[model samples]
Target: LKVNKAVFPVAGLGTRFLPATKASPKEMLPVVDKPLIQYAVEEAIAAGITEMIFVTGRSKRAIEDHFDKSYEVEAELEARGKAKLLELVRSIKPSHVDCFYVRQPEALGLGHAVLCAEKLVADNPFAVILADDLLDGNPPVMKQMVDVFDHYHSSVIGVEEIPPSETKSYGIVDGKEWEESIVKMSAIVEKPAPEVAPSNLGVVGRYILKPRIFEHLRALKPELQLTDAIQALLADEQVLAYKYQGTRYDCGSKLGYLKATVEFALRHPEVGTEFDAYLRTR
Candidate 1:
């Protein structure tokens, strides 16, 4: 089965970015010229995903409006002969692809966010991308996991080694080395303490999952964790982690978002030289 659908869990309020996020969504905050949500969407597109399921909440109107056609703005730009500006928003989404949205009324865990997309995903193998985790790499990290999932068809998760001190912040997994870049997990846990963590290896934001996960999701209760669901499925199926090659920025945090902004600016073609000069002058 070809993996063509992706679920983006953006229901959480961006509390870390306070006053600014009070009126605006944090995903709408730009790393440079593009919003963080755009970066995540483009990554999925690169991975050959043809459909999008955005699991959102009340304050996410900005995100939906971003992808929707802004008729008034387009008419104004077109009337003014602002071809460049008119063309920009047109690239918001590809014409061949489809996008769907669902609201998670209250703040829940990642598990609940994903379950919200169950109706759309149906029985197909789908992808789950956390908008907060920005991964920059050639071939795209999610694409790399998709390639692995294509071979196995069970599940593939994005993983990377992190400092033990950071264990509390992420889902951690450990397993015998299944292949060069993959780990065949014997066990997976969420937010383990530094002293007893399986290893520093932590699960990142990408996942290629089976549709039957909806079954596990339905049987569980709220305040759910995604790792718990994965663990439950592990007994009957093989769940592997690919320690993907890339630098992942947690745009959900102050420091991580700043780092992504500066790094991505340095890579920007049109303004790189000016930005580079400004950085050196400081």
Candidate 2:
């Protein structure tokens, strides 16, 4: 039951950002000093995941290049004796972690993106993180979910209360509270309209799933969604949802992206003070 691998689904077109994302992958968009995808990968590392499997698409070569070693840049920095800059550059992908990529020829959906990484993930329980959602937490939200996986030895999803009107934007779950802030799901609905949503609890982008979920995902056809796979998984095994101890910003939206930018900039060590002062005057 060791969770040492993580799947990152970064294949979406990011149509929400249009021209800003037309040429670059949305996951490459930066918040403060780091790209959104880097934040999710760093969170996975904090949770003990050493293998990162990315499901990429046609225009996503930049994502791969970002994580790869920059030999020319490193050598140039070394020649100039810019030690700090070199250190920062090399830290993008740590020494102990490994990254792998697989293409998702089409925009099949989240479940398909995850399924694309099955061989790399092999037989272990692994994490799935959607970089679109930026979660700020003390121990990192994925780290908290890993603890839940340790106790239950089953799949678990990060969830939080959302306004009923926003249900159509998320996967809504229906379940009984199994513990404080933990729910053992009876059902899950994907982007249901407010009038028919099962509950106000909306699924976030963090998930620690047992490899068995791959089977459920394959059984469902194209445009496969993880929510539907999880619901199907419920018929044979247990799936739990945790109300994560964190604040989540949906970076996929323009408003959420702006909020994350301002908030992260305010908390950054190098610029917090200056940014805070500047914010007050504005």
Candidate 3:
């Protein structure tokens, strides 16, 4: 099955960045010039995805407005001869791609957020991207996984090897190597203690999942966990874990957000030189 649809779970009340996120949507916080959610969407688009499925919450109206055409803004930019700015706004949701949104309605876990897209995605293979994880991969992480899905016709989860000591913070994997950087998943453990942990390879929030995952979610318990859902699917179907290529920024945290800002600013064509000069002087 060809992959096209992608689910982005943005319903969380980003409490960690409270006060700032109290009134504003945390996903709207600027990573440089673009919001965190935009980076995730562009990455999905780069992977040849033609449609997007956003599992959004109530406060996320801003997120919708951003993607939507701002005719007033466009008219103002056009009237003032701000051609560059006009082009940028026009590029938000390009003609070739389509977008759809669904409300999670409650503070559900990632698995439930994904399950919210169930009605929209009937039988097609799709992707689930955690917008909080900003991955700057060479070929783009989703594209890499899409290619893997094409080759194997099995679900592929993006993974990266983290420090064993930090294993408590992520869903670690245990699998036999099927090929280079790809593992045929045998078991998946969610945030296990270091000693009993399966492996240091953690799930990095990118997945090319089959529609059958929806069934697993439907049969889930009150407390939903995406990792547990995936592990359950392993019982019936073959799942692969790919060590995707990229430097990922965990922008959900304060430190990660700061790091992404400085690094991305350094890479920005318009501001990099000046930003570097300022850094050098300091």
Candidate 4:
């Protein structure tokens, strides 16, 4: 139940972002000053994740490079006496956590990407964080779910109440309200039609999964959807949906990416005042 490792599924071709993603991984898209994946990894680190298993694919070397040490850049910054910038880039890799990268040859699905990390996760519970979803909150979204996992010792996924009309965009869950913030789930329906949705509570991008999930994932069809595997796990085990305290932005879309950029910039200590002032004119 003590989750310490996290799997990051970053292999998508990111066709949505077009020319921008053509040269750069979409996960590397900046929200403000930091890339989207960096925010997710920082959140994971905040929640006690000690190792990151990144499931990558071809042309995604940018991600690996982003996490690894950049000696040439650091040395140049040091020579220029830009010690602060040098330290900022060096601090990306925290001492408590180590990053492990593995390639997913095919762009199968989320389940397969997660399954690729089975050997890395072994027999323990691990976390799954989707970098496309940027969450902003007081405790950081994953940390809240990790706290719930400590009590439940079962799989805990972050859930948020979406408008009924938007239910088709997410996997919906039905359950008894265990608390104001948590739900004892009875079932989960993946991207259900609006009228048939179990509830308004949609599964967000964060998950704390048990190792048995890998077994279910492997037994699944190669091109299987991630939710299909989750549905299978729900039938065999008790899965809890925790209504996380956070403001989540889907950075996969152009509008969503712009929103996250402006919002994060407005909240930044160094740029907030000037950014807010400029926003008034626009």
Model 1 TM? 0.96
Q: What is the C-alpha lDDT of each candidate?
A: 0.87, 0.90, 0.88, 0.88
**Cα TM-score per model:** 0.96, 0.97, 0.98, 0.97
> Between which residue pairs do clashes occur in model 4?
none
Off by over 4 Å in 3: none
Compose the digit string of candidate 1's lDDT tens values, residues 1-282: 999999998888888998778866777778999988888889999999989888888566787888877889898898899998777888888787787989998878789989889988998999999878989988898888889998988789899989989999878998889788889887889898888899888998899998877888887776777887888888778888899999999998999999999999999998889999999999
Task: Note the residue pairs that clash in candidate 3.
Answer: none
Q: Per-candidate RMSD vs. true structure?
A: 1.3, 1.2, 1.0, 1.1
Candidate 2: stretches off by over 4 Å: none
Q: Tens digits of per-residue lDDT for model 3 on 123-232?
A: 99999988789898889999999999999999999999899999999998888998988899999999999998988898887999999998888888875888888999
Residue 24, candidate 1: Cα error in Å is 2.7
Taking the candidates one at a time, how many backbone clashes does each contain? Answer: 0, 0, 0, 0
Q: In model 1, which runs have C-alpha deviations exceeding 4 angstroms? A: none
Q: Residue by residue across 179-268, what tens digits does model 2's lDDT show?
A: 988999999999999999989999999999888898988898768878889999988999999999989989989899999999999989
Q: Which candidate is the best by lDDT?
A: 2
